[model samples]
Every structure is written in structure tokens, then in C-alpha cells.
Target: MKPEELVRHFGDVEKAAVGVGVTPGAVYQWLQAGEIPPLRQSDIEVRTAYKLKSDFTSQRMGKEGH
Candidate 1:
């Protein structure tokens, strides 16, 4: 999920972080990177009641250089 979606759904970074069991700083990093990092995707999906998808799978990997 993107930071925008997280914010749109949860309205606050802390709320999203609580939902995902991450610190707000970790969520901030996701915002800075413009999307959820790969590994955390499924966790977020599960914690967020599947409102967020783990769709970062192949699409993000294919688009950018490391």
C-alpha cells in the first residue's frame, strides 16, 4: 500500500502503526519511500482487515533500480 492510502484510511500515522504493530517512525519511512516496503505488505494487509493489499509484489520490483 502507498502512504496516501494508509493516511486516507487511518487518518493518522500512529493509528496505522498501531494497526500494523510498527512504530510510527517505521510508518514514516514507508511514507518517505512512497510505498510499503516489500516484507511488511502482508502483515499490513492482515492487520488492516485486508483493506490494504500486498500488491507491491512484482510491480514495484520491476519499476525501479536499487
Candidate 2:
């Protein structure tokens, strides 16, 4: 995911860090280093109206908002 994506996902450093059991700085550090985990792809597809390619079965794109 993009750094901005996470910024929105957090919206609050305290909540974000608490959600993942990490420090706020850790989240920022992880984001900069791409050390974060992959987003929940299936849940995301359901949440968003974005339709994946019909033949797509796994992640090939390493970035969000693709």
C-alpha cells in the first residue's frame, strides 16, 4: 500500500499503533521501509466496489490504488 493509504487507514497515530501493537514511529518506519503486511485483499475487494480482473487470483501488484 502507499504511504498515503496508511495515513488514511490510521487517521490517528495512537489508534493505529494500538491496533497493531506497535509504536507510532514504528508504523511510519515500517511504511517508509515497506515493512508492513499486505492488506486483506479479499475483504478489501468486498469493501470497495473496485472489480479485479476476472482471471486474477493472486496479488501481482505490490502497490495499493492500482
Candidate 3:
């Protein structure tokens, strides 16, 4: 999960770190680097069901329409 989703889930950093198995400090760095910075493609399908598949998994960048 990202920062905004984390806020909605709970107004704290540790909340977003529940199942991801990383410390809050690590999460902070991932946020800075753009994505979660750790999980593999398979992990996304099974672990982060709370998040939409397309939101994170889409290969493209920027606006949807080309």
C-alpha cells in the first residue's frame, strides 16, 4: 500500500505496514522511491488485495489514453 491509502486505512505509518513485513522506516523510504520497493509480482496478487490490481500493476505510465 501507498501513503494515501495508508492514511485512509489509519492515520499512521505503521498501519500500512501490517502485512508487508517491513518497518515503518522502510515504508517511508519506499514511499520516497515511488512504489513499495520490495514485493514481487506474485506477492501483489495474493497479498495486497486491498489495493486495485491495475493501480499498481499497469505497465504504462502517466495518462491512460495514448
Candidate 4:
């Protein structure tokens, strides 16, 4: 989904999964597979949502040094 779409929908992966009739595990898998679009800070207001995005982006970008 687009960043704006994500913002307009649920606030986080767990809620987004539920909103789309999926599981958290499935959401993670889709994220890992790069099947879903990246979510920006504007789309996520919760700390958990920010953490999820931070963790995923760090892992994906291989920027553990950061």
C-alpha cells in the first residue's frame, strides 16, 4: 500500500493486518518479501509502529552501524 493509504488505514502492522484480514506474521512476511510499500512517519503515530518501521528498515538496509 502507498504511504498515504497506510496513514488513512490502520496505524500499525498488527492493526493493518487485521484491517486487511491477515495476521501479524503475514504482515511481517510481506514486509520481508518487499511486497508492501514502506510506511513513513506520517502514516504511523504510535511508538510501536515507529519501532517496527525502524527495525525493518535497519535490517533491510543493512545499516546496523547506524
Candidate 5:
């Protein structure tokens, strides 16, 4: 999944962090670093229903709006 899409999945950067017990800064790094943290990946996978991942899965793209 793309970084922006990952953040959108959680409503926003802050919400993503809140869902994973991390800080907004950490979420920013996930994007800026071009990769999600390994530990957070597990949390995110379940939350997004396996639609996203650290590997940049783009098959389900062009679906989200706003």
C-alpha cells in the first residue's frame, strides 16, 4: 500500500498512530522512510482487513476518495 493510502485507511496520520499506540511522528516516518515498521505492519494488516501491507500492494488502488 502507498503511504498516503495507509494514512487514509486510519482517517489520518494521528488516527493511524492512535490505533497502533504510536505517535504522529512515527506515522510520518513510516511515509517519509518509504516503509512501514515491521511491528506496526501486523497491527495495520488486521485493522485494514488485509487490504494493505508494508510491501506497497497496489492492485486495490484507485478506490479511495477523500
Candidate 6:
């Protein structure tokens, strides 16, 4: 997906960058290079995009911690 779309889906580039453990510019670079994955939605299949906000929350809050 495009950088804007990725930002929209994940809330913002800063948040997504934190989630994926990368810099915001790096995310942009990935988008420019078309290096994202594909996702399976409810009906239509679309490219997998990064969810920065969600990822940041999970990572920062340690949701996966035991």
C-alpha cells in the first residue's frame, strides 16, 4: 500500500514506525519500494499495511509480555 494509505490505516507514520521498530523515513522508503505484504480482508483481498498506532500501543504497553 502507499505511504498515505498505510498512515491512514495505522493512524500515523510515527506510531507505525514505533510499532515496527523502524524510523518514519524507513517506512516511507519501504512504501516507495513497494515492499509491503498482502492482506486478506473480509471480502476483498488487499495489500497488508502497517498499523502504527496499534503496533505502538502493543509494543509500548507490552501486551505480549508474559
lDDT of 1 by residue, 1-66 (tens): 677787678889998788778899988998899878767887777777777767654355456631
Give one digit per residue, the lDDT tens place, for model 5 in 1-66.
Answer: 555777887889998788767789988987999888666676677777787664433333436531
Q: Return the top candidate by TM-score.
A: 1
Instruction: List candidate 2 segments past 4 Å from native.
Output: 37-66
Worst 10 residues of 2 by lDDT: 50-59
* Residue ranges of candidate 1 with Cα displaced over 4 Å: 56-66
TM-score of predicted structure 6: 0.41
Q: Which ten residues in a row have the lowest lDDT in candidate 4?
A: 39-48
Model 4 TM-score is 0.42
Q: Model 3, range 1-66, lDDT digits (tens) per residue?
A: 344544355456787566555578866776687665434323533566735233355434336731
Candidate 2 residue-wise lDDT at 66: 38
For 1-66, candidate 6 gives per-residue lDDT tens digits of 345555666578787566555588877776687654322111111223333323333355675651
TM-score of each: 0.73, 0.42, 0.50, 0.42, 0.62, 0.41
lDDT of 4 by residue, 6-50 (tens): 434677877876655557776677666655534433233243455
lDDT-better candidate, 1 vs 5: 1
Candidate 1 clashes between residue pairs 3 or more apart in a chain or in different chains:
none
lDDT of 6: 0.49
Per-residue accuracy of model 2 over 14-48 as CA lDDT, tens digit each = 66566546678877776677545445334333333
Clashes of 1: 0
lDDT for model 2, on a 0 to 1 scale? 0.49
